[PDB]
Design a protein around this ligand. Structure first.
Ligand SMILES: [Zn+2]
Length: 16
């Protein structure tokens, strides 16, 4: 959750 706190809304910047 440290980085992935947008699990309920994945976006482009969150590409990994
Ligand atoms: Zn994000």
């Amino acid at each position: 959750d440290a980085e992935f706190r947008h699990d309920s809304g994945y976006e482009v910047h969150h590409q990994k």
